[PDB]
Every structure is written in C-alpha cells, then in structure tokens.
Amino acid sequence: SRSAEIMKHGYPGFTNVRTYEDFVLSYDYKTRTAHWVCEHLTPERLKHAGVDRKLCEFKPDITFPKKFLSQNTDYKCSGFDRGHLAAAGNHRKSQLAVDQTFYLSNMSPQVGRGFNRDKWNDLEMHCRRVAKKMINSYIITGPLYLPKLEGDGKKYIKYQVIGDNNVAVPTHFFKVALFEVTPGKFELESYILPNAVIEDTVEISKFHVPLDAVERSAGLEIFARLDPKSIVKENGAK
Amino acid sequence: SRSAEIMKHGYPGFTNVRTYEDFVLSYDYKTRTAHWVCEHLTPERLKHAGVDRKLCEFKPDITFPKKFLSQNTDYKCSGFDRGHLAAAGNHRKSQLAVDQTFYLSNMSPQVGRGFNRDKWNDLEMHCRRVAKKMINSYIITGPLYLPKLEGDGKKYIKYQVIGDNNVAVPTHFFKVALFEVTPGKFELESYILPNAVIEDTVEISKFHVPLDAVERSAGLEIFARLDPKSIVKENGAK
Ligand SMILES: [Mg+2]
Ligand SMILES: [Mg+2]
Secondary structure (H helix, E strand, C coil): CCCHHHHHHCCCCCCCCCECCCCEEECCCCCEEEEEEEHHCCHHCCCCCCCCCCCCCCCCCCCCCCCCCCCCHCCCCCEEEEEECCHHHHCCCCCHHHHHEEHHHHHHHHHHHHHCCHHHHHHHHHHHHHCCCCCCEEEEEEEEEEECCCCCCCEEEEEEEECCCEEECEEEEEEEEEEEEEEEEEEEEEEEEEECCCCCCHHHHHHHHCCHHHHHHHCCCCCCCCCHHHEEEEECCC | EEEEEEEECCCCCCCCCCECCCCCCEEEECCCEEEEEEEEEECCHHHCCCCCHHHHCCCCCCCCCHCCCCCCCHHHHCEEEECCCCCHCCCCCHHHHHCCCCHHEEEEEEEEHHHHHHHHHHHHHHHHHHHHHCCCCEEEEEECCCCCEECCCEEEEEEEECCCCCEEEEEEEEEEEEEEECCEEEEEEEEEECCCCCCCCCCCHEEEHHHHHHHHHHHHCCCCCCHHHEEEEEECCC
C-alpha cells in the first residue's frame, strides 16, 4: 500500500488518521487543523503528469464529524492564508492527489506575505530540491503552540483562534525531513519557524533545532522506527 | 470485560488510551495531562472493601514515553494541586483500583482552596450521591482550554504551563454524567467549571452547559453511541 510506503518510518501519532491518495494526515478535532502530515517523495514522483492546480478547490474533508470542521468562512478576512501543510507541489501524479492537498484538514492559519508565500515556501522548495538527489525522502509537517516567558516570570501558551469554528492560529510550525542518501543511510533536517513575517534574507538553517525539540513541543514521536545509527547527518553536521 | 463495561456508551476519543483496573484514560502528550477519563458507577461499587487511600502514591505512569511524562516536581510550588480527574472516591472496590487514580496521567494542575478541595469535590460528591439512586452511572471528566474575546476584537486561548516539563494549566474542567434511572432511560448532566477560586455559595447547577459545548470545546464525542430518545432528562429539564 501507498500509506505503508509513506508511513514506513513511523506514525508520529494515531489520532484521527486519514490516508489520502498521496499523503497521510492526523486531524485535531480541537484546533480544527492537523496534528501532523507525512509525505514520501522520490525523484520519479517529483515529475508532473494533464494535471492542473487551477482546478483545485478549498473545501473541508467531510470524513470528519461536522462539528469538528473548519470551513472556508473561518479563514476569510482573518488576516491569515489557508496554508497547506502537505504542499501541492509535492503531489503531481494525479488530479485527485493534488485536489486533496486543498482539503481544509491540511490547512493551518498562516501569515501570508513574509511566511507562507515566502520563507515557508522556501523551506518547501528546499525539500523538493533535496528530495531530487536522494533515493527516498520523508517529510513530517505540523503546527506548534509554543510557550513564552512573560513579565510575571511564568510561562504561557497564547494563540489566536479565528472564525466561528475557532480554528487555532499556531505560534510556530515544525518540519522534519529525512533524506535517504545511499541505501540504508539518511540525512535528517529539523526546523521550527514562527508563524510570522520573516525577512527574505534570513537563511532557513537559522531555524534548525534538534529533532528532540520538535518531539517535545509537538507531543509526537518522529521517525521512531528508524535506527539512529542510520542517520549520518543531523542538520548539516556529522 | 471491565473496560467494555465502563466504555459501554462510547469512547470520547482514542488518543493514547490506557485502560486501568477501574477506569479508562486518554493521555495528551502535549499538555502532559489527560484528554479525558471515563468512569462507571453502580450502587454496589460505592461500597468499601479493606482498602485505604492513605496507601496510594502520586507517581507517573511510565507506560507513556518519558519525554511526555509530567513529574511531581512540575506541580511542586507551582500554586496548583495534583487534581485527580478520575476521583479516588469513585474507586472503593480494590487497592490497585484506587492506587491508579494517583497516576500523574490522571492529574491536572488545579487551584486548591476554592476549586479542587472545595467546589469541584462537591460536584464529585454530587455525582456519587446520584449514582446511588441509579442502576448505572457513567462519568466523563476532562480539562478544557477555552478562548476569550479580548479588547482588540480577536479571540485567544491562553494558559499557563508549570514545571520544566511544561504541564498545561487548564482554563476550565468539564464533567458529563449519565445516570440510568430506569432500564434504557437516562438523565444527562453536563458541567463546565473554571479552574479558579469559586465561592462556596455558587451551586453546581449554575455551571450547566449543553453537551454540545463540551464536545466542541474539548474536541470529543461523548456518549455518541447513545440514542437521544433514551435520554428523558437534560440538566434538570424534561
Ligand atoms: Mg503553503
Ligand atoms: Mg481532586
């Protein structure tokens, strides 16, 4: 199966899991967005087939209960884009595959100018470009709701919710990418970027974090089924 | 089976489910506390055997990964009690049953004077008192993180996290209680109380909500597998 081929190195969690044609998603009934999504790219899979992104329509995934759905109206005039976790550009092999990347379960409220349309997209483009020199590539993407130290010396998680459905606006997003460079051996790259305007001059390497930090902040077990010795490079090191 | 006996009317969720001796719990790797607990009561099960709560100890359940565990040190000098979601006093039929209610998975950071020790406990006693005039009784309890409309006209969820493990301090707690009064006929009671000091003169009935508000706030499906026609009483009405 295509799902087992994607989820080969572990499910980060097993909450409300949905297997689409070309990616896997875990949906959070509370935040009205994803816990995480997982993708598998090969250089062959990054080659386009009469497939058209202009045909795609933002809509909910109605396999989830009605009361836990985000709707296009939650995102209208909110100040945020509907930002795709599993990117459209990664799924080019059928119309339905890419159509599904426009399901609102794969959307999180994202700052547009300076993030989604810019620095975040850069990180997506980086992964595809790197996926081209590798045998297999696996990417986990998802929202974070990170605590901050405030004035009174205590820590608070604060995040906006938008719309009547109260879809959560993540403070940050993570992205873990696992690239198979030679059979059995992998490069690992972990990122946490703020859901905020980032100046086009900042390089993505600056948002490098350990994989341990993503796991703790996200409440997720990432690439749990991969032997750590098979990793020959974490964030550009070793 | 006992878990099947407890979960007769439905799982609110399936996230990190741990079935203990006498209750069922869903743990949240992110908040370091529970999504929900489920309890079942009969008049028989509210009778004591030689079992003593003084024997119990606050510890984590190490069946959960270490990075997702809350520790006693997180609650120490935090301003909060270890508030049991599944109450010790609902579990009087064995020593192991009660011992388990002192797992940190069953604990949430709660205000002590005016809540845990005071208004929440009354609600706990209320459920027990009713459980005695009823054939069967089912209780779902869990924490909530509720958004607030602020001055800028935007909504935010904001909550404190305590300890080095960053355990969430919930904004509110819910409790839904399903009492079987005659065979296949039910009285439904739903509550939401704020994790705050509540004056002892407020009656618990003042915290009634529709079941829908609990489902929407918590992102859970409570008693979903129950015929609404089986319910003959909602929050004191009909
Ligand atoms: Mg995007
Ligand atoms: Mg208590």
